[PDB]
Amino acid sequence: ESADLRALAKHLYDSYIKSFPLTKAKARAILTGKTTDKSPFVIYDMNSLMMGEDKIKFKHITPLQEQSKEVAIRIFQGCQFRSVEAVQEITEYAKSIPGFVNLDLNDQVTLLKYGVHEIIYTMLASLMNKDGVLISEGQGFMTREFLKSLRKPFGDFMEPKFEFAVKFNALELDDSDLAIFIAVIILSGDRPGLLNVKPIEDIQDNLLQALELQLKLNHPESSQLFAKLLQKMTDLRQIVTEHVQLLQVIKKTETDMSLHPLLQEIYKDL
Amino acid sequence: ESADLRALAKHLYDSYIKSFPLTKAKARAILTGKTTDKSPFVIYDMNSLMMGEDKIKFKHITPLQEQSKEVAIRIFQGCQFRSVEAVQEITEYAKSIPGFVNLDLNDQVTLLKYGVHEIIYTMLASLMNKDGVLISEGQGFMTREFLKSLRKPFGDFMEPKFEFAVKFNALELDDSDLAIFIAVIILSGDRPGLLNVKPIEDIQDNLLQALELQLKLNHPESSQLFAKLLQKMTDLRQIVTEHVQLLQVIKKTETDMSLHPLLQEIYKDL
Amino acid sequence: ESADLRALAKHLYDSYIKSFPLTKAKARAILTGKTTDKSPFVIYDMNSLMMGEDKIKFKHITPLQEQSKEVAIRIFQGCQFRSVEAVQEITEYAKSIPGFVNLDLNDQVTLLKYGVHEIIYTMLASLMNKDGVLISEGQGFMTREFLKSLRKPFGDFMEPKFEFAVKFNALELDDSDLAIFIAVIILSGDRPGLLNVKPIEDIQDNLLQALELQLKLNHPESSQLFAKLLQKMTDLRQIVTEHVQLLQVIKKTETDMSLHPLLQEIYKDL
Amino acid sequence: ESADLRALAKHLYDSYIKSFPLTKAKARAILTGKTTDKSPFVIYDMNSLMMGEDKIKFKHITPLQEQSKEVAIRIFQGCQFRSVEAVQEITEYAKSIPGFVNLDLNDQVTLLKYGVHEIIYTMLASLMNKDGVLISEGQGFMTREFLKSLRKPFGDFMEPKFEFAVKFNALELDDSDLAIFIAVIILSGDRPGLLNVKPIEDIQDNLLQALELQLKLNHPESSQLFAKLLQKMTDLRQIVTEHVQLLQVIKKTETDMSLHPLLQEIYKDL
Ligand SMILES: CCCCCCC[C@@H]1S[C@@H](CC(=O)N(Cc2ccccc2)Cc2ccccc2)C(=O)N1CCCCc1ccc(C(=O)O)cc1
Ligand SMILES: CCCCCCC[C@@H]1S[C@@H](CC(=O)N(Cc2ccccc2)Cc2ccccc2)C(=O)N1CCCCc1ccc(C(=O)O)cc1
Numbered sequence A, B, C, D: 001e002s003a004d005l006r007a008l009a010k011h012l013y014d015s016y017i018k019s020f021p022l023t024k025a026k027a028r029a030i031l032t033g034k035t036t037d038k039s040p041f042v043i044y045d046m047n048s049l050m051m052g053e054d055k056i057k058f059k060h061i062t063p064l065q066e067q068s069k070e071v072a073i074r075i076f077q078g079c080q081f082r083s084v085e086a087v088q089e090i091t092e093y094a095k096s097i098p099g100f101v102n103l104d105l106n107d108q109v110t111l112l113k114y115g116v117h118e119i120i121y122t123m124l125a126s127l128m129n130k131d132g133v134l135i136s137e138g139q140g141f142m143t144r145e146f147l148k149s150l151r152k153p154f155g156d157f158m159e160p161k162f163e164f165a166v167k168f169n170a171l172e173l174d175d176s177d178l179a180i181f182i183a184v185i186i187l188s189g190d191r192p193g194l195l196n197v198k199p200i201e202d203i204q205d206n207l208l209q210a211l212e213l214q215l216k217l218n219h220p221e222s223s224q225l226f227a228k229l230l231q232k233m234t235d236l237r238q239i240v241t242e243h244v245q246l247l248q249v250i251k252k253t254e255t256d257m258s259l260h261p262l263l264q265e266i267y268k269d270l
């Protein structure tokens, strides 16, 4: 029901609004150069990384970076802090998903467990441009080279995230559309331990129709955006696929490396 | 354009029908479909094979289980052949798509170079069911169980592909439907090295359009099929990466076997 | 380039076969293995000894235990003679080796002058077993015991070769493996009195890269065989020195035997 | 896995680092004096020789040279003074290679028994440049020709060593590299009195895999640095025995010459 779909739509909107602070909307208004209430303090090298330690809030080893826990570490054990934060919001927005919180207790988790990372890169896009990506609330702009120049491992960590973002953003999906896309993802139903599935599908349908008319409407010209959009999902897989294989490395190679429970539990290889 | 979408959809059925031997139709009839006609022989256990292997139109090596390849190695080195074939089938077909042949020969090489697999794993499905799969012109039937009983690298090869058929075939798609879905696979347009993506997406779109109306007209009581059937290429793409991982792996596991040369080159890998 | 390697192998294999009539495959077909075909006349005692040459395919002297020469010596002398044929064999296989002839002869000789012995014990390793050693076209089999009961500086010369063997043999290597293994020795590059090592050193590396891919291939389950192998040019390097000890030790014995000249020459000592 | 491999090594390095004092790196500092910090005090003859006993703590005689003990013996003992200490480090280190102590006691010792020397000559290498060898905690220095003149025996009890050092050094391997090749050494598999080897073997294989990768990574240009480095494994033994056999002489030649607790036990011909 159209009238019920705009409802469904609009319904997921405010939620996304209330579960996530850095909307694509704000995150884009901190990337262009137009308004300069406060632009993003940019990070491109060490002098700046450090300079941004004072200018920006980085509750980590302020002075050196080498001998007392190298930086890539602090820069990596950083995302993992934002991380916890993501699943916080993410899960939250999932709580609001129509009928979602009804399904098997065991499954909801699964849904979150996986779809949480896939959703992390979905969002993440609106956070970056081909010059770099914003950090800590978009209160800063870490450059693409700064990262690219890092230690043998982590060094390739993000570089493979732009090609996706660049393209994903190229569809020009505003906020109003994201939430529902963030909705579908979650109600996938093709995950391990998926106890009872048809329901998660009945839901995902609700949100596949909804989201559908949202593109047509919100993007009259964006012919085939839906198909185009749903397609992106594969992109998001490999990325999550690959990412994992990294934490697969990193930890059995960084055994002092801690890991918050929500992550400890979603960080499940394969 | 409706009517035009109507004919495109037919255009492709015809050709597909002409470029493709074992269809989902005739397969079904044979598989889970009764039609107790010219039923196939079955392989349910290692010997049950040998004691059947001599009962079919193969072409390469006789039943030699000692210093002459083991079941495993011979069944895969058999897919390859068959795949190698359908490659041309998908090729001749591809040469029937509106505007295709008009593409640059490099992209035509590309479009085909990657989508072939996806095309393949999708069609393999018209021969699968939870229990097994058609073999040798579907003149036989390999069991998911039997197959499961094979050498270490090969054992869990189909198990996860089998899962796909489950979900893919769950859509109960008919040939006229696969006919376009398969056309979309060829002109995916995101492939590496395409030098003219404009047109490749121009056609494809006219195909997503053509597809949609199809899935509609023939499945009026099943919404989001299109959007479902679409959000399936990620499963395929997923498989694609597996094959090429469960394979590259075998490269440095069967190189000594440089007794493949001309047959090894006539095949290469895909 | 793996293609390059996979062939160098068969090339050298070929030549190992063409150059070396008796192989392991056979020194094994008649050794402990069965194939009960051309059973090797055994020598367990001094008594069987004399009763043997009157049947053994030897060419020169008869089992003259009528105050005509003495056994041990006689049984030793039969070795050095063998090795002389050996050298021919090996001196030929040498030619098969990539640009082994493009090197200054003031090295080619050396390489052979020094390697030869090693290649002599490496093959002997295949003619034995914890229980003995094949003799005369393997058309015979001297015991591990009988030889122990031999004269003062003789009844305890091979033991180490046996002690050795075992180990080596345990790599269940095949002549196709050994071909390449032999090659790598020849171009040992660390031979004293070398003139232009560069080329040599280069080749042996190619060889080393061929051998290495071999074991990886030929033997898929046994890592570090390659290493467990290069750890063997050492034992051989030792055993070789035995060959000297008894020799410069033999001088003080079989010497005044001036009814030898053009024979103690044809064989000299190496 | 390359993950578990780049780790063993990493572990194996600090070990080396925290066990063996003067490193190859710290050493190559001294030898290449483009610095001033604390240059060595070189001994090029008796003239100079009696000066190290001024700025250096030469635990040996300074007044008269022959009667109340001569110079060669006054050095040799000094050589084997490090020996006892050579024990320490490795012995200490030995207990760091995973699964070491986990072996049957006796067997443990064996690895130490013999391998205790090959490392020594391995570690002495980094100590010496074509022109000589550092001595006394890297402070003092003892020339080649200086030692090349000593009493009849010792006279050349180093010349051949240098050669090896000279040649070995050229592997341009560092401590990361060594530590492992030091681990592989101890972790033999062909020692006189090895009850249970499959284990020893299974352990080295591990160190050997680590090693392999380590060399690639660190020396991407260094073609075959592996095989080559393993080749040296032979070389080290020649010297060993030669030291072994010429340490004999000095024994029955100099009957009062003692052989501190440790040394004796790890000293045995054959
Ligand atoms: C070594 C490899 C580094 C990898 C990439 C670094 C950029 C990330 S991206 C951004 C948001 C986010 O994490 N995401 C998800 C994500 C997951 C995987 C990969 C990359 C990004 C998106 C998010 C934002 C907004 C809403 C929802 C979700 C952020 O604040 N980042 C964290 C860095 C903060 C600054 C810092 C620097 C130095 C120090 C110090 O000197 O100690 C301390 C702190
Ligand atoms: C060891 C691991 C592999 C396991 C899977 C095997 C199933 C296939 S399914 C069928 C068609 C096809 O080839 N495909 C290709 C494919 C398969 C698996 C994965 C990916 C792609 C499906 C297809 C049909 C139509 C069009 C496109 C593609 C077939 O003939 N099969 C091939 C085997 C024939 C039997 C045989 C056995 C031994 C011997 C002997 O040596 O003596 C003789 C005959």
Ligand SMILES: CCCCCCC[C@@H]1S[C@@H](CC(=O)N(Cc2ccccc2)Cc2ccccc2)C(=O)N1CCCCc1ccc(C(=O)O)cc1
Binding pocket: C050, C053, C056, C058, C061, C062, C063, C064, C071, C072, C073, C074, C075, C076, C078, C079, C080, C082, C083, C086, C119, C120, C121, C123, C124, C127, C133, C134, C135, C136, C137, C142, C147, C150, C154, C155, C157, C158, C161, C243
């Ligand atoms: C004295 C101590 C014992 C020494 C070992 C004796 C057995 C050898 S082992 C074998 C191979 C070989 O020679 N080699 C060389 C080698 C082995 C060990 C050490 C040094 C050198 C290896 C070879 C084989 C294949 C290819 C290349 C090289 C062989 O034909 N043998 C030759 C002897 C035949 C018997 C005989 C005895 C007496 C009389 C009589 O009544 O007059 C006649 C015949």
Ligand SMILES: CCCCCCC[C@@H]1S[C@@H](CC(=O)N(Cc2ccccc2)Cc2ccccc2)C(=O)N1CCCCc1ccc(C(=O)O)cc1
Binding pocket: D053, D058, D059, D060, D061, D062, D071, D072, D073, D074, D075, D076, D078, D079, D080, D082, D083, D085, D086, D089, D119, D120, D121, D123, D124, D127, D133, D134, D135, D136, D137, D142, D147, D150, D154, D157, D158, D161, D243
């Ligand atoms: C006549 C025999 C000559 C033999 C070789 C001499 C060089 C050695 S090398 C070095 C340490 C070491 O032993 N090695 C190994 C070794 C083994 C075999 C041969 C040669 C060297 C290095 C090592 C350390 C720790 C671990 C592993 C390896 C050292 O301090 N050296 C000892 C001499 C110190 C100076 C000295 C001289 C004169 C006087 C006096 O007149 O008062 C007093 C002291």
